[PDB]
Design a protein around this ligand. Structure first.
Ligand SMILES: COC(=O)c1ccc(CO/N=c2\ccn([C@@H]3O[C@H](COP(=O)(O)CP(=O)(O)O)[C@@H](O)[C@H]3O)c(=O)n2C)cc1
Ligand SMILES: COC(=O)c1ccc(CO/N=c2\ccn([C@@H]3O[C@H](COP(=O)(O)CP(=O)(O)O)[C@@H](O)[C@H]3O)c(=O)n2C)cc1
Ligand SMILES: [Ca+2]
Ligand SMILES: [Ca+2]
Ligand SMILES: [Zn+2]
Ligand SMILES: [Zn+2]
Ligand SMILES: [Zn+2]
Ligand SMILES: [Zn+2]
Lengths: 523, 523
């Protein structure tokens, strides 16, 4: 019996086709992904293969102005149009709190939404009961397939689920659910979830009864053969894990941003044993036409986005200096605003040991692409912010040793004076450079805002201590020569869309007035 | 013909009786003022004198939780109960914008509200037409008295009137209105307004046809004889100004906070010439009973204030360190919060030469009377803020030369180490002390946030430059040994209630997290 699993993960609001690097589409002849093109390929496969499941491993929420305006209604609408068969909750599905997930996604999806390791408490437990499930048994042809969900145990640090949801250890929560499915004579079981490739491999190894793991979160690209685009595979597709009981369990993921459709064929015997599996993600490039009906519906929904983009988000009473002459040479107030917005976006619930789990921000000055003039009655619109932050990136959370962060600050000024992009704007950091010193030895003071403290205050950076830092995905990936960040980071989780972080902060503040205040000094 | 003018000014939300220093009443046998006691005395005078006018020279708005909750409805209600005959607009009547004045005061007052020098433009001119007037001619016995109003030309820097109101020069706007009243055979004219004793004397000298000036704003106490309480008179009551045409024009004011009722008797001849005048403010002490009906109505209205005081205003995720061990010895985050709230409260409309007219704050650490613990789910209520700021003061605006501010910072640490109250918490200032230097020479660096700049940044303080600074009225009056502030300031205007400034900022921010960030350092 052959099952074809089609899968997406970390689509992150890429409803429209994008450029090759998943940013705004500008060259139509080379644009990729989008739900209209995904519809064409899914429909084509479903004409040819008898037993198909279209699955999403979470993180449809967050990434573009589509999510900013429609807040999940676009996810329910377009996933329903694609006839997704099941979805696991991702961390970003909690960005607008549990109410922003219940309404509109859980109440409007025409498919089961799953997570076996999220447990609600208090009144929320009654309010949400049955709106997401630990698993669902689906009929596929003449057989049944059980799908069990899971979500990152670190979601409380990576989104806004609130205090009435408990994120349990994935393997601990999954095993009894898979044991239960086996008692109900379900012999084909998929674990679909959102914890990252490392946890997916552990689930494949340790959760007895799981036949395949379909994951996400880590934006992992897996491929068997010559890659079709610029993504470099972390391993073959599927990635085979040998389980504790000796089975070969395929693990799949399909990068992010709707650029690929994962495609895995699994051959099962009559008792649900996996005989073999093969496949590969399919690059959704211009060779696959956008479905005209889905595209026309996208164009209709885009009208409200165009309208929203010109509305006042809030006001500034100061000139927002995002010039290169300032932001690539010294502390600039646009850089301070963006880092303050990044820290505000990452305020999450804590135990009694931290005021917040993260207090620090770095931002390459070359990533700030325009100032904003305050003389248009102080108005700031999304279109103005998109000129400042045009790359479609995210502001991610990383864990870096103090030694790595000191090397990043040395890199920031290693060839100072040429208007290069690596000069860092900061938040929760006070750095002093002495440019008369040799490159690599120019940082003379580096103080950081504490997190494990009830009163935030600055203390010297410690080389062996690991710090959480919010920074662009461009820098987490080693852009601008920050190879030390890519190579030495101890954890990396994708964050919110860059424009959206700043827009939300400006709308919350109503009137902004960021100052240049001595976060960066020169001796 | 004898006219008795009863007058109040700068009542500032003191609806309830207060202590002798106009703070919370705690010893009933020695409490003063309040509208119930004012009613008793006004009613007594109106039984005995035939020609009485009860006037208010503005600034009923702002000062206690009454204004925070009722937003002017309490002013219309209790001024109507007292049967005020006329009121001039004060600067604080614009604290909640022009909408917060129209609704509820202008639409609910049963007396004319006056200002001849405020001119509206755009649609507002039609919306507000006739809701305030330049003047009103009132019948008094068998005669008529014209009352012409005026409001501080500096109101745009001292409240929130918005950009559709123009504040003209008082004398320029008053003269044509008084000329018009004279053409209508009105021969007895009172100028009632809110610009301060200095401007009141100029109006008495220069506006031809004005028989008496009833003022406010500067909280001036005038008295003829031995003063009845702790207020020291600035001059006799009335203060006589010789007009340009040789008339003797009485100028009156009655301190502030409803502690006194001004009482002036003017003898006019049949042609409206002033023959003589005499009087004195009456101390509203415990010897005058509170009117039981007004007091019972006050007690009824107080219920909603008690309810409001326990509601969550917003949350803190940090411990708000208002301890004396911190705030009298070093930068404390409660001090930073209060100074940031003071600067936010003073954001006003500007031309293109300033991002804001004021950027600096000083606050005596001894004025911070409690920390706030963040472990009650981060909740902050008005009752918690009242424990931090219990004195019932205001956060005022002063103009100080840099030399005066340097002397204030030397005073801040002149006897450092004894937990004395004068140690300053700051905003928009970065100071460095070297305590090994002799007292009076301990300030080694003092940088200030610019105002005449499009991007706020810090520069060294200049001894000859005048800076606007927000600070407690306690310090503006020379408290804590800051005699240099009292003696050398170039302008002083009373600001908003201390608790209200902080409450509004916390409610706007929703979640606060003030840090100790290096505003005060030690070498
Ligand atoms: C609609 O979207 C685009 O046009 C789009 C274009 C690219 C990507 C991918 O590359 N992402 C980048 C690329 C560069 N930079 C910054 O730009 C600096 C270079 O800028 P300049 O010295 O001014 C040279 P230029 O005028 O040709 O741009 C780098 O040093 C670096 O600091 C980034 O921050 N990011 C995130 C994504 C989208
Ligand atoms: C319900 O209201 C009152 O209890 C009320 C009491 C008074 C006033 C008038 O006085 N106003 C003040 C008085 C003092 N202080 C500060 O307190 C310091 C002295 O405090 P300690 O060293 O702690 C001595 P203590 O325990 O007896 O208070 C001063 O150095 C000064 O920094 C002020 O800030 N203000 C504004 C008003 C109201
Ligand atoms: Ca099986
Ligand atoms: Ca006259
Ligand atoms: Zn993701
Ligand atoms: Zn994720
Ligand atoms: Zn006043
Ligand atoms: Zn005033």
């Amino acid at each position: 019996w052959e099952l074809t699993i089609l899968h997406t993960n970390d689509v992150h609001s890429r409803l429209e086709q994008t450029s090759e690097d998943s940013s705004k589409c500008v060259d139509a002849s080379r644009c990729m992904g989008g739900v209209a093109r995904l519809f064409t390929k899914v429909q084509q496969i479903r004409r040819a293969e008898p037993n198909v499941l279209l699955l999403d491993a979470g993180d449809q929420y967050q990434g573009t102005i589509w999510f900013t305006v429609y807040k999940g209604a676009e996810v329910a609408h377009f996933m329903n149009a694609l006839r997704y068969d099941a979805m696991a909750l991702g961390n970003h599905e909690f960005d607008n709190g549990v109410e922003g997930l219940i309404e509109p996604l859980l109440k409007e999806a025409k498919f089961p939404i799953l997570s076996a390791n999220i447990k609600a408490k208090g009144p929320l437990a009654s309010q949400i009961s049955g709106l997401y499930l630990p698993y669902k048994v689906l009929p596929v042809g003449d057989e049944v397939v059980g799908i069990v969900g899971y979500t990152s145990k670190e979601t409380p640090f990576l989104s806004n689920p609130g205090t009435n949801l408990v994120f349990e250890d994935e393997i601990t929560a999954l095993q009894p659910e898979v044991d239960k499915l086996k008692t109900l004579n379900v012999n084909k079981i998929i674990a679909l979830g959102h914890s990252g490739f490392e946890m997916d491999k552990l689930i494949a190894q340790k959760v007895r009864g799981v036949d395949v793991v379909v994951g996400g979160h880590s934006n992992t690209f897996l491929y068997t053969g010559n890659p079709p685009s610029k993504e470099v595979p972390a391993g073959k597709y599927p990635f085979i894990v040998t389980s504790d009981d000796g089975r070969k369990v395929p693990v799949v993921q399909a990068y992010a941003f709707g650029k690929y459709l994962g495609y895995l064929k699994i051959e099962f015997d009559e008792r649900g044993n996996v005989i073999s599996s093969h496949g590969n993600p399919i690059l959704l490039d211009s060779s696959i036409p956008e479905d005209p009906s889905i595209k026309a519906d996208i164009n209709k929904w885009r009208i409200k986005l165009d309208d929203y983009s010109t509305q006042e988000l809030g006001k500034t009473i100061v000139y927002l200096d995002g010039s290169s002459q300032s932001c690539r040479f010294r502390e600039c107030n646009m850089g301070n605003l963006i880092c303050d917005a990044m820290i505000n976006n990452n305020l999450r619930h804590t135990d009694e040991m931290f005021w917040n789990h993260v207090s620090m921000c770095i931002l390459n000055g070359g990533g700030i692409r325009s100032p904003i003039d305050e003389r248009n009655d102080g108005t700031i619109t999304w279109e103005n912010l998109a000129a400042v932050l045009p790359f479609g990136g995210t502001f991610d959370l990383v864990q870096l040793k103090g030694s790595t962060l000191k090397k990043a600050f040395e890199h920031s000024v290693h060839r100072y004076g040429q208007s290069t992009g690596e000069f860092l704007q900061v938040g929760g950091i006070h750095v002093v450079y002495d440019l008369s010193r040799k490159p690599g030895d120019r940082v003379v003071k580096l103080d950081v805002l504490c997190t494990s403290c009830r009163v935030p205050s600055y203390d010297p950076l410690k080389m062996d201590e690991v710090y959480k830092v919010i920074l662009p995905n461009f820098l987490a990936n080693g852009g601008d020569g920050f190879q030390m960040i890519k190579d030495e980071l101890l954890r990396h989780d994708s964050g919110d869309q860059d424009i959206n972080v700043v827009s939300t902060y400006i709308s919350k503040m109503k009137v902004i007035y960021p100052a240049v205040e001595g976060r960066i000094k020169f001796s």
